Amino acid sequence: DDLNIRTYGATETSSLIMLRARGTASAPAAVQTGDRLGGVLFRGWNGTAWMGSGQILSVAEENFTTAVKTNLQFHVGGAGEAMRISNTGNVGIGTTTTTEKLNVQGNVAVSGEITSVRSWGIKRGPTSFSANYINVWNSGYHVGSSIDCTTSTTGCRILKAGTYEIRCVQRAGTSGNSVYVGIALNGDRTALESRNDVLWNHSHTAYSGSYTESNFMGTLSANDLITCGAPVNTMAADLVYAVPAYNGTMQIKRVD
Amino acid sequence: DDLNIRTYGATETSSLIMLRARGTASAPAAVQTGDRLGGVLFRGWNGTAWMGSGQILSVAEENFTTAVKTNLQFHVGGAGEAMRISNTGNVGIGTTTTTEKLNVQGNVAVSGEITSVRSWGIKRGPTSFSANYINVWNSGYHVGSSIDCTTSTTGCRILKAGTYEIRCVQRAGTSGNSVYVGIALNGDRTALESRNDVLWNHSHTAYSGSYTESNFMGTLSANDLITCGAPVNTMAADLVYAVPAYNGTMQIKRVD
Amino acid sequence: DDLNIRTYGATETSSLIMLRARGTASAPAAVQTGDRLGGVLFRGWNGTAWMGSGQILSVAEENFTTAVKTNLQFHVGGAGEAMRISNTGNVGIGTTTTTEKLNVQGNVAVSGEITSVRSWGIKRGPTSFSANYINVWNSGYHVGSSIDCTTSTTGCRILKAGTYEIRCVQRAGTSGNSVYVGIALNGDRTALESRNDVLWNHSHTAYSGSYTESNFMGTLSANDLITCGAPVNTMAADLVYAVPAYNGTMQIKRVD
Ligand SMILES: CC(=O)N[C@@H]1[C@@H](O)[C@H](O)[C@@H](CO)O[C@H]1O
Ligand SMILES: CC(=O)N[C@@H]1[C@@H](O)[C@H](O)[C@@H](CO)O[C@H]1O
Ligand SMILES: CC(=O)N[C@@H]1[C@@H](O)[C@H](O)[C@@H](CO)O[C@H]1O
């Protein structure tokens, strides 16, 4: 009891066409949001009834007098709706929320490798001491949409809530005195160091040209400005302030 | 000719319905595992035969008298089956094994950015010496499912086989002696360091408040306990043991 | 009303079959590249016309007398074509250029975790000084396809354009003199350090067994050989050259 559609020709093709209107044939009305345009439905005998065995649906996502917008839905026997393609082209697997081009509710296993754009940012060349834990940096650079290291000379602005890994280093001067730097939230070191869900640390150093370092790992909020510098001005005097990046840098990587 | 299904009105829709049973119309039997519920088949003349030119199948994944579980399969002329949606809603691309929500047998190329949960964990605040290469840590924290840094005070348990990048640092005290720490597998440094598929290193330091560092990068196994500490009890007396994380930390990131 | 296909039996199934040939039934001719084999088309009334409301198409990608190759196309009302499955099985979401098994033209959002192969590589055991900023390394190791750290003893070769995070450390000897190492592009430090789109830094050290470190973050070109070493022979004499990896390493991770 198959259904065959056979077409011979240079430009002709076979079509199964499912059409939907509201109203009647002589008085049709426009499709409304949520209306099903049509579906391919599979059903299987289990011994008692014809059970849902998957389906492929086209469903309106806008009233058609405004715009023709639809989604495609793929359902399986068992889980139900498994995949959705929205009118924007965004795809959801395991979710109907199609915010990004691909949205997976669950884990993803890839046998090969993944390439993508990665948000990261840097500051280079500590040129002066602005405030406790706030160096002024000679330049910044960044990639992606999560971090902005170029707008402000005194830090990197987090643009999106997320998890970040941060390392700041600066060279000690020639005095032989103990120096250190620390990563801070707009110069507030305790705001990061006191959290139970982060790593925050820093070392001391004294040998000329060696690094003191500070590290941070954890979540940050949109509009947070991350800074780094000496804890106090008198210690800043014993650190190297100059343009070359080898004198000191901050590096921020978006981890998730 | 084209097959058109046209539906008007407020409640109904156009539906191509494919139904499958075993036995006969008189003696219907339940669908069995591997039975095809139905399909949309595309065929094309190549001069010799009507060749497989793509198809969308619904197939039973279980005897329906047991459970109604189906998959949807998308095949193309050339590679054959290309994508599968199992009864769990899990999707395989280039593979029929749908362990996770999405599984890709191959590489993935993304033009934008990817957000997900990234497994990482930390120990902070080395407060006593437990054993060679094992500090007791005041607290731990972790994110995700691969690393457990809270159950035990003397290290982080690797919960999933994978690749990890680990850095451990600790401050020298005031003795002036050369000190160091090392990352180890439950106190066994050699079990990590002697492998030809890993990075393992460590530095010495002596300046008060300077950091001695140890690094590892490589695969670890489920149930591994990663520790870090001084190599012998006598050197521990020359390292800083106290609660604040700037005195010492261990950080573990899952890389793959 | 609905179109029902129903089949009872153990061998056959219910199937909509769309067949395409060129020529005529009396003289059929092979399908040609670009020919539509068939489609499942949805259409909806918008007030004045039956508008395209999504469709699933099978389309030839090759002249069938050469080879049977098709793609499957998923179109929604609004964006038009949203997903392509090429004859290779490669899937494109928002792109028809299906270079990898899965290609996404946009961002990806995953609620869980992603596992994949990660390109990374290392060099261990600085054994001798080959030239400025080029140590010879006793061994290397790598995983993935972006980086080769074993073919050349003097560095890691970048095999794919990408963004890389690199850290090089080496132990100071016992001279008491200031020492440092630097990461370089086959010995050329300036080729990396002078770029406005990268991080490049290095520290000094003098304590025996402590690390001098150099760091890099940024894009690199295929065929780049990344080296690390002392800036001149007389400073190499003041660094530790020996086989154990704790004497010196280089670590490279592909970031994107
Ligand atoms: C101790 C010190 O500052 N020495 C610097 C060195 O670090 C720097 O790499 C080089 C410029 O290439 O200039 C030297 O004078
Ligand atoms: C060890 C040292 O000399 N200096 C520490 C400094 O590292 C620490 O960060 C600060 C409290 O925040 O307390 C000082 O005593
Ligand atoms: C003073 C010195 O160099 N000590 C080394 C130590 O760095 C190294 O980690 C260990 C190997 O287990 O062998 C010791 O001799």
From TrEMBL, chains A, B, C:
The keyword rRNA-binding does not apply. The keyword Signal applies. N-acetyl-D-glucosamine binds at R171, R189, H202, H204. This is Cell wall surface anchor family protein. The lineage of its organism: Bacteria, Pseudomonadati, Bdellovibrionota, Bdellovibrionia, Bdellovibrionales. The chain holds residues 852 to 1107 of 1107 of the full protein. It comes from the Bacteria. Disulfide bonds join C149-C156, C168-C228. Keywords: Signal. It comes from Bdellovibrio bacteriovorus (strain ATCC 15356 / DSM 50701 / NCIMB 9529 / HD100).
